[PDB]
Design a protein around this ligand. Structure first.
Ligand SMILES: Cn1cnc(COC(=O)N[C@H]2CCc3c2cn(C)c3C(=O)Nc2ccc(F)c(Cl)c2)n1
Ligand SMILES: Cn1cnc(COC(=O)N[C@H]2CCc3c2cn(C)c3C(=O)Nc2ccc(F)c(Cl)c2)n1
Lengths: 138, 137
């Protein structure tokens, strides 16, 4: 009945993030470790902090639930715990990455970088500079 | 790992919502139909609107993913049963909390949470016949 874009309120879209190839995204394991190492005080906080903070909280907690289900399938039975890493994995990797990068580097900067990298990675190797464009706050 | 309370930033807690019995919560089916019927324009909006709006969006989309997984398991009995038992309650709590916070007002939904839990726990013979009422006035 409804069609909601997790990214739309943050000035992007599901299509735009599917621009970046699936192998550009860190692991889930590494993305949660990074949110923890950088933002645990703020994520666990009893303040909104920012809309990015709100969204990321739910994303982390949701990944929890999806994994609790996958674990519960394993302790009540292989191809199921495989499906998550294939399809939902990319989804949360995109979403965790977007929000962490938006808090670290700045939303506006992460949006430029999204197109920057997608254009470059799509340029064939022999014609493109040897290194990607760089994501930074300075 | 980390320990995050979806409700904490909204002035409540996971414990507090587990106060209300599981059969007090509308269905998921009915909760999404209600968010749609009341908030579709705002939820689909490209504006934050409110922190409640942000959280609810993610909750709805997440329930989507959890069900897509359960459907994909079925098209590949007790698995699609587990979701309605354990995660179902979780999303019913969370969808209800956020919709009720947008409709009636956060502060009002927090009072009502304790109000109802105290009353439902009072034995029948001693408690008024009707629950306390959740409303805007
Ligand atoms: C020559 N120069 C000038 N300034 C800088 C600093 O910039 C980088 O090296 N950027 C690295 C660091 C993080 C990063 C980099 C490149 N990309 C594509 C990323 C990235 O966004 N990774 C990332 C982002 C968010 C995350 F949560 C995790 Cl786990 C990883 N170099
Ligand atoms: C002066 N006065 C007398 N009556 C009223 C209106 O109040 C109720 O009838 N309350 C009912 C209607 C909705 C409701 C009621 C009691 N509870 C616990 C709820 C409720 O929270 N329902 C609800 C809330 C959010 C939802 F998303 C859905 Cl699907 C349902 N005002």
């Amino acid at each position: 009945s409804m069609d909601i874009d997790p990214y739309k309120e943050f000035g992007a879209t599901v299509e735009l993030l599917s621009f970046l190839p699936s192998d550009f995204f860190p692991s889930v394991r590494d993305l949660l470790d990074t949110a923890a190492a950088l933002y645990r005080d703020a994520l666990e906080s009893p303040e909104h902090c920012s809309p990015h903070h709100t969204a990321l909280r739910q994303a982390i907690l949701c990944w929890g639930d999806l994994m609790t289900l996958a674990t519960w399938v394993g302790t009540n039975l292989d191809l199921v715990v495989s499906y998550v890493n294939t399809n939902v994995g990319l989804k949360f990797r995109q979403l965790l990455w977007f929000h962490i990068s938006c808090l670290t580097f700045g939303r506006e900067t992460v949006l430029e970088y999204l197109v920057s990298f997608g254009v470059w990675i799509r340029t064939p190797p022999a014609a493109r500079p040897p290194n990607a464009p760089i994501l930074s706050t300075l």
